[PDB]
Design a protein around this ligand. Sequence first.
Ligand code: MG
Lengths: 156, 54, 271, 126, 151, 161
Amino acid sequence: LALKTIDWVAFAEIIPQNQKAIASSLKSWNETLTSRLAALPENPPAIDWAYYKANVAKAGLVDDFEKKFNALKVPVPEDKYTAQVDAEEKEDVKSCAEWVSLSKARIVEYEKEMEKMKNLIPFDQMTIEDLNEAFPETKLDKKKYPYWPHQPIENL
Amino acid sequence: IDTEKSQQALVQKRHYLFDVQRNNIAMALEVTYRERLYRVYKEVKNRLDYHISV
Amino acid sequence: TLKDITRRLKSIKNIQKITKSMKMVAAAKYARAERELKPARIYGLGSLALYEKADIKGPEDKKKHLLIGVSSDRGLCGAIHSSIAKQMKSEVATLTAAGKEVMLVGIGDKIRGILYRTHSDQFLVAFKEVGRKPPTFGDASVIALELLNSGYEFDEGSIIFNKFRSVISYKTEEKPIFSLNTVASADSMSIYDDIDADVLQNYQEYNLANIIYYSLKESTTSEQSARMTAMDNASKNASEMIDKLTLTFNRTRQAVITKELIEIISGAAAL
Amino acid sequence: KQVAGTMKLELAQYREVAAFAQFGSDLDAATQQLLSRGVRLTELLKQGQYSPMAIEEQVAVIYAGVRGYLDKLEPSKITKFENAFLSHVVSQHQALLGTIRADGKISEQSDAKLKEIVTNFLAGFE
Amino acid sequence: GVGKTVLIMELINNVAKAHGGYSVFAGVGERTREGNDLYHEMIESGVINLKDATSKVALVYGQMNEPPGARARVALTGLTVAEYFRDQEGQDVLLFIDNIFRFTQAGSEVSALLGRIPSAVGYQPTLATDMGTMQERITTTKKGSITSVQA
Amino acid sequence: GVGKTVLIMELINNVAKAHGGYSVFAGVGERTREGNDLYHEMIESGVINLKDATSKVALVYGQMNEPPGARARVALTGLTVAEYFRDQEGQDVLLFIDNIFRFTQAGSEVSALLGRIPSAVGYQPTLATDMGTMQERITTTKKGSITSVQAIYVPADDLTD
Ligand SMILES: [Mg+2]
């Protein structure tokens, strides 16, 4: 018996909206499956023989029944389902690994940018060029308005 | 920054999906297996009681 | 009979709880009827404050007259539609005594049904759907539209509603409604500025709509309160009837028990 | 006793006004909540046949029903809830029920645990 | 109004075709006009054949113009006729009783004639000397089953 | 749930302290469970004292599970105890009768057993006379008095019964 304990809202956090229902169904299955496990013990109580050895007057019926029972081996079925989900998990691991690496690149970039913005010239010594560098938005559109004051008079 | 940091832990948690599937696999397996064990136990008990009854 | 007594008692119990429910609903509407009055009361009185200050008196020498009466489409109010009916009848009588050509307009199915029979010729337009929903200025604007687009130039008019006084008290009141020529020719209107027939006409129409709205917002509160009180009285009446029926039921129950006992003992004592 | 006192009180307050249903939309909001909670409780009172609940599960469900947790759930689902929730509570909180049965009271510790479980399941419940 | 004798005749025919069971119709204290109408409708609906032996019902009629003793025991008569089918041929028989109301009022007349039990007692479906022992013979024996339809 | 038995015990205590007269409690047709509950409540509140000679009330019980003769005569038994306290001691006695409608019912049953024709409703033909010969002993004399407190049950909430 190898069962992996699980959160459940964490599960809900990682379901893409395209396939919620099936996942939810999956979820449902789990719970009822768990109940169905608690609905019966591990092994059935083996039928004794003496009670039938001394009460079943039929010749050999109890005997050959018990023997063919001992000679019976129930087919314990094999999954053939875990390997594929393992491989799918592996692929998903690769994908999320590359994703998180690229995102960490983006994070260190944001960090460097904020750091640049941190080391700033005290404003009373900054030229309009330094301001335009520190905020490319403040730069005037020398293309749409190539003439003074290079901006709509309204917002002036 | 932190939003990306949030996205980091989230994808980090993604592994729950697979093991839950695994959980249902091993569960349903033992279910059908044990169900078979009680099917065979019930059916032989039925014939046994039938003869001792009649 | 015990069974028919139970039947009638169940009937009266049914209508008793019905009136209880209706009374509580009417009180729930009296809530939001008294609230939306105060702003609307201020608004309507602010409208009228001009006529009040300039002290216009209307002409007593002209005949064409309009009588608007505000009511609802719902009954069970009590003395609401009856009061409006009586006031409108009395004033139609008094005015037509002076030969004044009087026309009628009724806001509400009830007042129109009450006044239509005895007064059908003296009638221009009525209105329905008033009473279910708390009245709003859109309604008053529609009414003013319909009144102006009627081919009837009233030289004077008056609206009659139920000025809500308290949860138990209401007074049937009657506000006057002047026409363009009245305010124009009023000498006391000479002190008002940038005034000409066009501006006075527009202002007249807007004040007509304003006063109709004000009357509506007053009458709805008055009617909710009256319905509350009337349903309370009906519940108490049905309760008294239930007590009478319970007395009669106990009497009949005793009689039935005694009769069956007599049957038993007389069928047994014959042996 | 702890849960049934308030249950009976609220049910009396519901019955003393239940005649005013079918026009609740036109009534005071507090009494409207009274009516809604009353309907919630009555549907919490229905029960299938040959299924006698244990006492601790009884107090658990009545608790989840009386503290307003179902005020936001419409009535036609309560029974569904009452089933699923109960299963949850007996599946992954057996120790809590064991303690409540060993004491017979909702201690503030077990009270907080009940807060936790009912909140979490309501959040998880459809 | 609604067609009900058609429903009774169809229940008879269907239990006789699907299963190998017959039916017994008791007319305990009932209008002779209705009884004749039903007898005819059954004849002309195939349930009864006056020229064969393939009829699917046995009739027991006690009309209203008979003493209370008649209209009280005419229920047990049909009950016995169906009891034979049940406990002799194992069938699932369909016993119709036109009214238990007629049975109980005819019986109350019986009890008032003897002058022992007052007329306020009526009949008790739980007393053995009353409808009790009749409503108990209509059960699911482990040899068959009578089932009673009471119009 | 309205504190009836507390009012009974307080009346007993007050009459014993102020007027110096004891009390009698006739339990006509009482549930035995309620009889025992009341007994123990009286033991706690000091009305009854199982250890000394300072008890205030004397109890007389005819329970719900007795033949109708006993349930009809228990009220007279309690009344006789109280009559002794009034006459031979010269006191102001209290006589609690709970219930009195069960006294009437016991009378009706005793009548129906003796084969007497029932009156109106179903009570005995001697209803008023039974109640009269009972109640006319509870009165004031030139020696003392007897003040009766009777719990009234109204059948089918009908006072014209
Ligand atoms: Mg019948």
